[PDB]
Assembly symmetry: C3
Homo-oligomer: 273 residues x 3
């Protein structure tokens, strides 16, 4: 096993408090909360309770309740069914590190569990609808994957070592897990092909509906099906500066002391050129 | 707060009856039903009970039950988790008016809550899969939105007034909310860009998968990514007639007395040309 | 009524055992399990219990539990909310036969209930995100379908027989239900138009995001919006051999005795040319 998003938060911030469950629990959540005292949330006080909304619909009910004016996000509450949500600290998602202020949808965390990704960067914004799938094998008479359920030991072996010896890397085998940089935007209905992409450059923008079939260089704004660059983010000199200064690894104080360097693209250039 | 779809229906049609809950309640639903007598649905009689299916899967179970032969849609039953469903009367959806016989999916109601839309017309058919998102800011060194969580008062102010002064209207700021006309069809996997669209013309057809990036004139059938017209609905003289006669604002009696004007496009033209 | 996926499995494999419910039941599931003894799963033994995970999230919890090491898929457990999941035997899905090792998502089973499909083949792999919708009527002044809710008997009749007399087959009327062959791959965000497609050839590959608007001949690899062939699977002589040998109708013993005929495309050709 390994820790879920909620478990990681509770480790940090629960601080011996009781867990006030806001919503109908699921068996998975009840396994998580088994070591703690917990109860169906009634009257709640952040000094004594940490509130776990089960679903995002359960969260909206809580935040509409006057009782939640005192609760601070992450420190005092969290949604349980939200493994790919943003956090103010670096977290883990099935041995995939993801930085701060970084969210994604069920498709991506799904890809994380499969191991299609090695890391997601900082301040990265991925739409819920986006999907990341590998490709099936093209070298054989079949493309069905679940035919593998019918194979014995002997058929499994001969099938499983033909996949390992493949250039086009089916099922994301034989390749490095994908790497998604910081300050990336991925739009709705998008697709990144895990069998052929190894890295998405920092600050790259994927237009919505676009279908990425190969690595996107840093700051390449890409649309259309498949994905070709229509515009770059900034000048190539500005690109190479951002990759050394690494403002996304900054502290919070460094963000609020160099605000207007971030707000103005070329005001930044004077300071870190 | 403001009234949900269910609350609006119950106001109209509950008429002092008890609410028979068909399904496992959610905390959000239980907040809604708090003022009324309600119970886990067992034997139900529309003379005494109004049946609220919690989920759409709960609804199918009810409609398969022989007990539901006597219940009429809206008047006697409704799904709770169905904020974007059709209704025989004009309704509200987060201060967004939507006409009669008009449905949409979770993406659109999501856009409604954000305020990306000003109104949805009558007899409008929007696929569940469709999504409506704004664009992030392109004028800065970053595109991440949730970096805003790290800003203090002072950083928030300088960041928030640069957005207000923007031509491309990021986050749907500084622009009129979108307006969706009557008799519109939007297909599956579609996308309308809330940062750049202000109005979708009445009777416009969005082909599925199409990505609308700018206003669609009335009756423009549009496909492809992005969205360009491949065909118009009717002749331009027929277009300008429909915009004055406004058959979608008709009564029910006017629909059933002028049936074959609606069924035949050019039979309509003789009456209202 | 007709039998769901779970009911069909339980008929085959329950064998007088008790149903151990792993998760929060739904009213629909509780209707299914009404004839059997069943209980909230605690300590479970496949000799005495069949475990029904309600949701797929409930399933992952079960499979992470050490108690599930003894349970075999289908024979001893199954997800309830998974009507379009793979099975080792041919099954039914709303009078739509689907072969072995064949899965699809909520869109397709949705299309099945509508009757847009006549059969799904063997070893067919359809992404969850794929959608299958018919087209609305284009012959009239309106495209809204739910305006039909406002029609009386008389308006319904004149409206319903104009649809039956249509070349473009709106609402999948007047046409054969769609047929999906064996060994088909359909990718994410895809769309097959039920109003214009009658058959997808065996072994056809639909690239993800592609929008199929007309029949795909066997083994045509198709991408882009709309869907045009960029490559065929195998040589046209190999195509016509696979359609007679029909390896997807094989037994399991025939799969494991002719493994390397399936793994190697042209090694197959020597045996069955
Ligand atoms: N507020 C509407 C809510 O949105 C939900 O999720 C969708 C979307 O809104 C939601 O928004 C995501 C959240 O996830 C995540 N927790 C924080 C992130 N900043 C936010 O960002 C997203 O929505 C922001 C609106 N602040 C937009 O500014 C931003 O453009 C967009 N990327 O992510 C989903 C993407 O598709 C549900 N769709 C809807 O039912 C619900 O009501
Ligand atoms: N009947 C199948 C059901 O469909 C559900 O939702 C999908 C679709 O079917 C459903 O259908 C919508 C409903 O929403 C809404 N309440 C009324 C509207 N007339 C209807 O319309 C939609 O389905 C009609 C089939 N009358 C089609 O005639 C019409 O082309 C299509 N726009 O909207 C969703 C769009 O994607 C679930 N996908 C599936 O699980 C369920 O079983
Ligand atoms: N393992 C991740 C899980 O995936 C889920 O569903 C998605 C996907 O993964 C899932 O996978 C389907 C299953 O359905 C179905 N029961 C068996 C089938 N062999 C499998 O196949 C799919 O995932 C396989 C990963 N073996 C891939 O090898 C294969 O390329 C892909 N078609 O189908 C969905 C397609 O979109 C959820 N998205 C996620 O929450 C969950 O955690």
């Amino acid at each position: 096993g390994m820790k879920t998003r909620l478990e990681q938060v509770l480790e940090r911030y629960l601080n011996g408090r009781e867990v006030a469950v806001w919503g109908v629990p699921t068996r998975r959540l009840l396994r998580a909360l088994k070591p703690f005292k917990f109860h169906t949330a009634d009257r709640v006080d952040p000094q004594y309770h940490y509130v776990v909304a089960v679903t995002d619909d359960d969260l909206t009910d809580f935040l509409s309740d006057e009782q939640s004016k005192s609760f601070q996000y992450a420190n005092d509450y969290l949604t349980f069914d939200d493994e790919g949500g943003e956090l103010p600290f670096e977290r883990m998602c099935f041995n995939v590190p993801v930085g701060r202020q970084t969210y994604f949808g069920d498709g991506v965390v799904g890809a994380c569990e499969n191991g299609y990704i090695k890391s997601i960067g900082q301040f990265t914004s991925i739409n819920g609808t986006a999907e990341i799938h590998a490709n099936h094998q093209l070298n054989m008479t079949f493309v069905s994957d679940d035919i593998q359920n019918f194979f014995n030991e002997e058929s499994m072996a001969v099938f499983q070592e033909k996949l390992r010896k493949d250039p086009k890397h089916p099922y994301a085998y034989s390749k490095e897990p994908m790497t998604i940089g910081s300050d990336v935007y991925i739009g709705a209905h998008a697709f990144i092909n895990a069998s052929t992409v190894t890295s998405i450059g920092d600050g790259a923008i994927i237009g919505s509906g676009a279908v990425v079939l190969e690595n996107v260089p840093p700051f390449a704004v890409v649309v259309g099906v498949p994905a070709r660059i229509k515009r770059y983010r900034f000048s190539k000199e500005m690109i190479e500066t951002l990759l050394r200064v690494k403002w996304w690894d900054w502290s919070i104080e460094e963000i609020n002391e160099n605000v207007d360097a971030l707000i103005s693209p070329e005001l930044f250039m004077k300071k870190y050129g």
